């Protein structure tokens, strides 16, 4: 078992020094957005909260070392920084998870791509798509094996761009804006082109 791990560093061009960090990276803000919700409220991903804590502690240590605090306080600050970084990478792994309002644990980096939710199984292997609809089904006994009955409104919504093109090129609308306006109000000329 030990050789399984040791051989990886031996038979490669990488050193195990990477397990100790001297500079933690920061994700771009857009992936942790601070969006101004309607009415002036702000919604923030809790990830950027974790980061803040790290920085705070990392600042305090820099102060304590500067003025020569007793070794006990410096060691306590170093331990706190270690725990903060650990929770940033993986919250709740070692100790009790960090919680904000209420009692719900914060979502760490690992949680963003860990399980059923996240990115791998929720945003990479399968995703929501445009030009799609859904509706209840009923039996059509007069249909052929290769035919299906599509509601008028659903078909219009699905084919809106094609309908707009066929409206503008047939001189029903003078431009794309006029064709879109005509389709939204569903004037009679739309249904002739839809079929």
């Amino acid at each position: 078992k030990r050789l399984k791990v040791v051989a990886a560093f031996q038979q490669s061009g990488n050193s195990p020094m990477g397990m100790v960090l001297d500079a933690v990276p920061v994700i771009p803000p857009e992936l942790r957005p601070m969006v101004q919700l309607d009415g002036g409220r702000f919604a923030t991903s809790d990830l950027n909260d974790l980061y803040r804590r790290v920085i705070n502690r990392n600042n305090r240590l820099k102060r304590l070392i500067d003025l020569g605090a007793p070794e006990i306080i410096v060691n306590n600050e170093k331990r706190m920084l270690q725990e903060s970084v650990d929770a940033l990478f993986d919250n709740g792994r070692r100790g009790r998870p960090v919680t904000g309002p209420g009692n719900r644990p914060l979502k760490s980096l690992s949680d963003l791509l860990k399980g059923k939710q996240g990115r791998f199984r929720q945003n990479l292997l399968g995703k929501r798509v445009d030009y799609s609809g859904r509706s209840v089904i009923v039996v059509g006994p007069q249909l052929k094996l290769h035919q299906c009955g599509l509601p008028k409104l659903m078909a219009l919504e699905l084919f809106k761009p094609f309908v707009m093109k066929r409206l503008v090129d047939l001189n029903h609308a003078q431009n794309i804006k006029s064709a879109k306006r005509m389709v939204e109000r569903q004037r009679p000329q739309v249904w002739d082109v839809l079929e």
Partner: protein
């Protein structure tokens, strides 16, 4: 057109090279004027401008200056969508 995807163990040098600036303040946005604070999270000098070709102080506000770093605030004038691809780092003691 990708040939292969290689994973490795990032070192301090790689992390520093990835970054466009060190984050050394926990501030995200000021309470009034709701704009990003300097040197903190969401900093424009590090992660890029919030608007397209508009620096913090507004000296440069048009596409013609694309690529120029404002000498008064340090914000590069580029697409606002660079804020989802610019990384920062924290140098911890």
């Amino acid at each position: 057109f990708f040939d292969e995807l290689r994973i490795g163990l990032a070192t301090a040098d790689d992390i520093r090279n990835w970054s466009y600036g060190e984050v050394k303040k926990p501030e995200t946005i000021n309470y009034r004027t709701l704009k990003p604070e300097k040197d903190g999270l969401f900093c424009e000098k590090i992660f890029g401008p919030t608007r397209d070709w508009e620096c913090y102080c507004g000296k440069y506000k048009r596409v013609r200056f694309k690529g120029i770093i404002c000498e008064r605030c340090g914000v590069e004038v580029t697409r606002a969508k660079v804020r989802r691809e610019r990384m920062g780092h924290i140098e911890l003691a």
